[PDB]
From a paper:
The icosahedral shell of alphaviruses consists of an outer layer of trans-membrane envelope E1 and E2 proteins and an inner capsid layer separated by a host-derived membrane.
The binding footprints of Fab fragments of five neutralizing mAbs (EEEV-3, EEEV-5, EEEV-42, EEEV-58, and EEEV-69) were mapped using cryo-EM structures. Here, it seems likely that mAbs whose Fabs bind to E2 domain A cause intraspike cross-linking due to the presence of three symmetry-related copies of domain A near the 3-fold axis of the trimeric spikes.
Residue numbers in the entry:
A (entry chain B): 501 to 825
B (entry chain D): 501 to 711
C (entry chain C): 1 to 218
D (entry chain A): 50 to 245
The structure:
């Protein structure tokens, strides 16, 4: 579970494990795929997707997911998590605002991202309905058995941990997690690399002038922009994405039927939608003479139909056609 | 770069409830530390008891349960048994590696005392053909596991030549040890009465040979 | 069900290499990786790392990155520890272990290494029969003294291992630069000397095998 | 639409790290100094101006590029078709797919039939066309290799597999603020975002 710098972490820029990168309000189904720097899913070892492992300290905390909250302008709905990554059904929102509850603390993370949800169709809803026609939307999956893409996930760079740099009663005293690789020296001249167990520091004294580092590359990370490079190498760790964008047919929009009214080679149409509906036509002469107008306000319109025919498209309701001799 | 700490030794009686704890030097122990409890019986015999804080390995009696009490992982033995006398180690996960605790030696009342079974053997003859003689004194099945072995050549406490191993735990949980008195083919033939005296929970057992 | 049986204990002079095997039984090797733990004589238990028996990638504890190398004969359900350029302070016991259930559930028997300079001396195997006179009880104790060998280990059985009940084998101890071991066996007084009782001793380092039948002193 | 899939910046603590122009599409990279990067322990690099930060970001096809993607074409005239039914005579049936070029028969059924060429050569497609899912746009797409950032075709990949592309996104990295680790990528949202 990677940890990075959340931008407006409740107060201001903290370093949250759930630091939000790559917000994708690019689908249609009320859904956003998000990456936390935290890797929830199974535990550290082997069990139960519905548990929760973020970083506390240098360490993980692979425990229950109890009170996740993604949210935006309104509280979102989770869809599924896998890896670093969560899918959640959100409404539109100027921002994105994520957070669980460990239990002692709220411990959330928030971010800017322009979000919208147009459904696919000539109706510009704000939200998916219960009914209407199905038609080919873009949307992310529920599932994990997924390989359609993979993002590079090589090592972490080092990280700071000044909990290490204690004092040896006059000298600044570094320690190690588990024998991990601590990269160490101070502004003064003393040990210059640091690949060690718990060292002391002969020369410097102040904690604030030393290299508290953790080369702990036993587990790779996501290659966040808010990661410091592991300077050594491009290690392996090519790793999939679960939530591929797929060609789901969203349960989708439908605009109320029109009121057809006859006139001489002319369609008066008293019209009354639910939401802004893009109407348009095609006078089937080799003179096309089409028309487009989003209609949200109910409006009686007109169409000079010709002899050979016109067609009529009340939103994603199917196209009509008309003989006006 | 984390230090797991455990009680050093705990003594209980059969039928009691005893709690062992596991403390982390970095902070409270939490479910993301996946506390493990391992038991070591004599003979370098390891078995896992609990994992992921409270999952009991299969075939581990139910008297054993794990949990988090306060800021530490705990193992409770409910109805401790004589068989539970062993060393219990806790292990904690720290995002990338495991750190083991120092282990807690637990002692449980039980196993009525048992006197040692002592046998003294004479130097074999193929060995007297090497110009050497070694009297072997074997002591097995004693409990408590502490003895005193004293050798006496011809009435006189030998004081050099002997070597006594350290009590080793047998399977039944009783102990054993052997003592060796090495003479020369010649020292052998000289003196006439050898005796291996074993002192255990106050009684003495003397096994003498006669050349 | 699950048995992790390890190689026997070695002796090696400083500088040498050792390959300790761990043969797994009872589980599907591939879904459970292996923990290698060092229990040093005094010091207690320490995680040396873990090997992904699926991909084959090892993790080393920082204390162990370097001379230590984990590998696996996948095919035979074996994991192996190799310690190269043996240092004298590597004498200890190494356990393989199965990682499962958010911890470790099964531990092996242990393979103990004694890093120590010394030549190769074959053992002398001596029968230990009761005193020349009498010895009349409901049972009887015989013995076998394996004296003056180097290095460790020796193996000892009674009647090719068919006689295991009532046996006490005593841990080898170093005396004057050589190891000495002994074993006792107790049987009913009707068994011996009616039926043959034989001590079987092997010392791999010297390719020495000795079968010594316990004979009555007269 | 692009995805500014930022590679994680370098932070040298005392002194410079010169960047190189890696061959990634629109590989924008700019060295930066004068940081003090707060990373989980306050700052970590002990210098105060020699603290160097090298930001790098390249453009990459979205995962939606595979599936939700506009698609340009140079469109010529080709050859028109039809599933002509004839419930002929007393035959009463043939529903056959045919052509227009005036020497092609299609002996499906029993009759041999030659069609066209039609005189009405209006291809409703223009020469240049963009295509999107089902909505087809007879658009003068600028070209591969040229599309102005923000305008349509800021990202221009030959196909989905094609690792090479043209990414005029005007991607301009800026220095991170007040000694904190992050990557200001200042960029036009795509001309595939608009165009929708």
């Amino acid at each position: 579970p990677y940890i990075a710098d959340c931008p407006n972490c409740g107060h201001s820029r903290c370093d949250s494990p759930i630091a939000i990168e790559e917000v994708r309000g690019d689908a249609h189904a009320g859904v956003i795929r998000i990456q936390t720097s935290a890797m929830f899913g199974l535990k550290t070892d082997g069990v139960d997707l519905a548990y929760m492992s973020f970083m506390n300290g240098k360490t993980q905390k692979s425990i229950k997911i109890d009170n996740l909250h993604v949210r935006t302008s309104a509280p979102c709905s989770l869809v599924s998590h896998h890896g670093y990554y969560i899918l959640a059904q959100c409404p539109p929102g100027d921002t994105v605002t994520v957070g669980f509850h460990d239990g002692p603390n709220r411990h959330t993370c928030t971010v800017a991202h322009k979000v919208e949800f147009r459904p696919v169709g000539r109706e510009k809803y704000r939200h998916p309905p219960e009914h209407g026609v199905e038609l080919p939307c873009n949307r992310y999956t529920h599932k994990r058995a997924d390989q359609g893409h993979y993002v590079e996930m090589h090592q972490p760079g080092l990280v700071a941990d000044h909990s290490l740099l204690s004092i040896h009663s006059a000298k600044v005293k570094i320690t190690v997690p588990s024998g991990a690789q601590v990269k160490y020296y101070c502004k003064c001249p003393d040990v210059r690399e640091g690949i060690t167990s718990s060292d002391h520091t002969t020369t410097c004294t102040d904690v604030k002038q030393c290299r508290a580092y953790l080369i702990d590359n036993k587990k790779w990370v996501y290659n966040s922009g808010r990661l410091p490079r592991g300077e050594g190498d491009t290690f392996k760790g090519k790793l999939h994405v679960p939530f591929v964008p797929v060609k789901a047919k969203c349960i989708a929009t439908l605009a109320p039927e029109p009121l057809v009214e006859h006139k001489h080679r002319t369609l008066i149409l008293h019209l009354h939608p639910d939401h802004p509906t893009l109407l348009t036509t095609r006078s089937l002469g080799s003179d096309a003479n089409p028309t487009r107008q989003w209609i949200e306000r109910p409006t009686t319109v007109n169409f000079t139909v010709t002899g050979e025919g016109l067609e009529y498209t009340w939103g994603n309701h199917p196209p009509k056609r008309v003989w006006a001799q | 770069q984390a230090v797991v700490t455990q009680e050093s030794a705990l003594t209980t009686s059969p039928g009691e409830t005893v709690t062992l704890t596991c403390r982390s030097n970095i902070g409270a122990v939490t479910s993301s530390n996946c506390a493990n409890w391992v038991q070591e019986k004599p003979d370098h015999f390891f078995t896992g008891l609990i994992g992921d804080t409270n999952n009991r390995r299969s075939g581990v009696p139910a008297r054993f349960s794990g949990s988090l009490i306060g800021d530490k992982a705990a193992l409770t033995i409910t109805g401790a048994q004589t068989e539970d006398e062993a060393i219990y180690f806790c292990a904690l996960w720290y995002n990338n590696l495991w750190v083991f605790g120092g282990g807690t030696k637990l002692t449980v009342l039980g196993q009525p005392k048992s006197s040692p079974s002592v046998t003294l053997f004479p130097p074999s003859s193929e060995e007297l053909e090497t110009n050497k003689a070694t009297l072997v004194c074997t002591i097995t099945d004693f409990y408590p596991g502490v003895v005193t072995v004293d050798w006496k050549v011809d009435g006189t406490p030998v004081t050099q030549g002997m070597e006594t191993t350290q009590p080793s735990k047998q399977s039944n949980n009783k102990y054993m040890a052997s003592s060796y008195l090495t003479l020369t083919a010649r020292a052998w033939e000289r003196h006439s009465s050898y005796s291996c005296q074993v002192t255990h929970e106050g009684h003495t057992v003397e096994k003498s040979l006669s050349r | 069900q699950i048995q992790l049986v390890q190689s026997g204990r070695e002796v090696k002079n400083p500088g040498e290499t050792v390959k300790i095997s761990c043969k797994a039984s009872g589980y599907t090797f591939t879904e459970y990786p292996m923990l290698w733990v060092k229990q040093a004589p005094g010091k207690g238990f320490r995680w040396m790392g873990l090997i992904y028996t699926n991909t084959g990638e090892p993790t080393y504890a920082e204390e162990f990155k370097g001379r230590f190398v984990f590998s696996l004969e996948i095919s035979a359900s074996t994991a192996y520890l190799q310690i190269n350029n043996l240092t004298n302070e590597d004498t200890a016991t190494y356990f393989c272990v199965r990682d499962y259930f958010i911890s470790l559930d099964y531990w092996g028997q242990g393979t103990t290494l004694t890093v120590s300079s010394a030549k190769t001396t074959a053992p002398s195997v001596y029968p230990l029969a009761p005193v020349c006179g009498g010895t009349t009880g409901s049972s009887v104790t015989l013995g076998c003294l394996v004296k003056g060998y180097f290095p460790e280990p020796v193996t000892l059985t009674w009647n090719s291992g068919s006689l295991s009940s009532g046996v006490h084998t005593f841990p080898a101890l170093l005396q004057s630069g050589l190891y000495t071991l002994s074993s006792s066996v107790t049987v009913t007084s009707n068994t011996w000397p009616s039926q043959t009782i034989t001590c079987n001793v092997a010392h791999p380092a010297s390719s020495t095998k000795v079968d010594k039948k316990i004979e009555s002193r007269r | 639409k692009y995805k500014t899939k930022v590679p994680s910046p370098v932070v040298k603590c005392c002194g410079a790290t010169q960047c190189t122009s890696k061959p990634h599409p629109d590989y924008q990279c700019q060295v930066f100094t004068g940081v003090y990067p707060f990373m989980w322990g306050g700052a970590y690099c002990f210098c105060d101006t020699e603290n160097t930060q090298m930001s790098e970001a390249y453009v990459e096809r979205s995962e939606e590029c595979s599936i939700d993607h506009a698609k340009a074409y140079k469109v010529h005239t080709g050859t028109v078709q039809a599933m002509v039914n004839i419930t002929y005579g007393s035959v009463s049936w043939r529903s056959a797919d045919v052509y227009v070029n005036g020497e092609t028969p299609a002996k499906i059924g029993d009759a041999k039939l030659i069609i066209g060429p039609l005189s009405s050569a209006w291809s409703p497609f223009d020469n240049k066309v963009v295509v999107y899912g089902h909505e087809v746009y007879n658009y003068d797409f600028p070209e591969y290799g040229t599309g102005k950032a923000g305008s349509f075709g800021d990202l221009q990949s030959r196909t989905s597999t094609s690792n090479d592309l043209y990414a005029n996104t005007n991607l301009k990295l800026q220095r991170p603020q007040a000694g904190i680790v992050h990557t200001p990528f200042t960029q036009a949202p795509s001309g595939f975002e608009r165009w929708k």
